[PDB]
């Protein structure tokens, strides 16, 4: 948890989130349900698609081994060929193993960052009209119906519209 | 009324290794190493190989009496030879 | 034996003939395409 979102203040994943990596859950008088964030998921798909494609192209021109025959009087020459092919394979094995380990750390941390950005995007948009419960959820001080929830999901919350109603409930 | 931010999870058990953590469960993973072979010496691009068998390269070229089946060979993709 | 795959790596035998993927000595090479799996609360 480099960014503290996955396994951090959001301690559990969602099994009902089936149409995207990341998204929202809401619950009001009308009902409740999940909704994947397609835009953030698509951007994540772009990095992983390019990250793997870049991996293939780099080791595209890896060293290739060719069999050779040497007589019993060419022990030194045969040893050179043996140590060259073994040495090159050891170098390329290290590079392939290291790249996978380094990218796995990068990929898991990249996925961690996107939730923190998504969590902060909603928080900075509902500045004062909600409570920050600290477990990844926000509690509204006003009535937020499906049209209001959908505005929060697509980044079009009308803070001045609910500014007056929220503060009356917040104060008392 | 509440809204929450959360992340996808499933019943996967695929495990990957990171720079400083081992056996990390991930929702989806891809293995990019091939470890399976049919175990048979097939033809390459539809061109059968040249099977010398018990006969050697010098024996085939010199025309060894025990390599009479190699006195005329067609095009080959690769040559198959024994260690001894 | 023969190799029938689309993956870019293999560890069967260093000596290969034809259009073959790149040989490495690693036992496994698994990339994580998805995020970490955390059990439901």
């Amino acid at each position: 948890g480099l960014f503290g979102a996955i396994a951090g203040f959001i301690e559990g994943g969602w099994q009902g989130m089936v149409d995207g990596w990341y998204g929202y859950h809401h619950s009001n008088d009308q009902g409740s349900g999940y909704a994947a964030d397609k835009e953030s998921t698509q951007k994540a798909f772009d990095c992983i698609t390019n990250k793997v494609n870049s991996v293939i192209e780099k080791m595209n021109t890896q060293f290739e081994a060719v069999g050779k025959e040497f007589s019993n009087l060419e022990r030194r020459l045969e040893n050179l060929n043996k140590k060259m092919e073994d040495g090159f394979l050891d170098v390329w094995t290290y590079n392939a193993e290291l790249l996978v380990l380094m990218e796995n750390e990068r990929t898991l941390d990249f996925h961690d960052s996107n939730v923190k950005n998504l969590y902060d995007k909603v928080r900075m948009q509902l500045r004062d009209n909600v409570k920050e419960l600290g477990n990844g959820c926000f509690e509204f001080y006003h009535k937020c119906d499906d049209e209001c929830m959908n505005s929060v999901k697509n980044g079009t919350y009308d803070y001045p519209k609910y500014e007056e109603e929220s503060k009356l409930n917040r104060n008392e | 009324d509440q809204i929450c931010i959360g992340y996808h999870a499933n019943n996967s058990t695929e495990k990957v290794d990171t720079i400083c953590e081992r056996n990390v469960t991930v929702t989806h993973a891809k293995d990019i190493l091939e470890k399976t072979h049919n175990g048979k010496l097939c033809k390459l691009n539809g061109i059968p190989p040249l099977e010398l068998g018990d006969c050697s390269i010098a024996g085939w070229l010199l025309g060894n009496p025990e390599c009479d089946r190699l006195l005329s060979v067609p095009e080959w993709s690769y040559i198959m030879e024994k260690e001894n | 034996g023969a190799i029938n795959t689309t993956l870019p790596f293999h560890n069967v035998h260093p000596l290969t003939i034809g259009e073959c993927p790149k040989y490495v000595k690693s036992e496994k090479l698994v990339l994580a395409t998805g995020l970490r799996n955390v059990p439901q609360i």
Partner: antibody
Amino acid sequence: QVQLVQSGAEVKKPGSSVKVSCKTSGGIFRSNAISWVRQAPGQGLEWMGGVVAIFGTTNYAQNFQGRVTITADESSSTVYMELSRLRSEDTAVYYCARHSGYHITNTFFDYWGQGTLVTV
Amino acid sequence: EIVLTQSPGTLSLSPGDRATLSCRASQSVPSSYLAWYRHKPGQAPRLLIYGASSRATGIPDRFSGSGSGTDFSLTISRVEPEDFAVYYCQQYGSSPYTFGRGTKLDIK
């Protein structure tokens, strides 16, 4: 350089099923949603259904609900379509179309398959 | 379910004539999600225009289109010998993903 390869032409009889495949190249794993669009000769193209890239969620048109089953295997990056209970006027050319994104919604068909002709 | 009505139907032209194809929608297409495809018989359809205002990659400059609401159009300033096929318009802003009637271009 992305191409979609489908199965061959098939002939069937009413009451049977069809299994049309569509394998996509250009990458290790499929990252774009694939849908199925058919064109009956003398009629226009119709949308049958589609499958999301990684999560495998499937959406079907109300006309073909209960008769079409679209499945994909992540190992082979192939998409299959299974149309059951064949009847008259099910003769058409089936194309597999690749969406511009990972999801069916708000995405257009970047590329199309060459097409398979199925007769009942 | 948005039904798309393509008006011209048949449009016989010669290389050089301006080609204007009109696609009409029963109800407004959200976010102007409409695309145009070229489907020569015996070949897989190819994407010409997506979003009603954006040209697809590799498409020659002569292909362009514009529109909004329920009215969309495709314009080909200069007709070439390869511009004779059936042209469809789809809307991808609604769930059913409906398709247009299609218009074949003939040789005068």
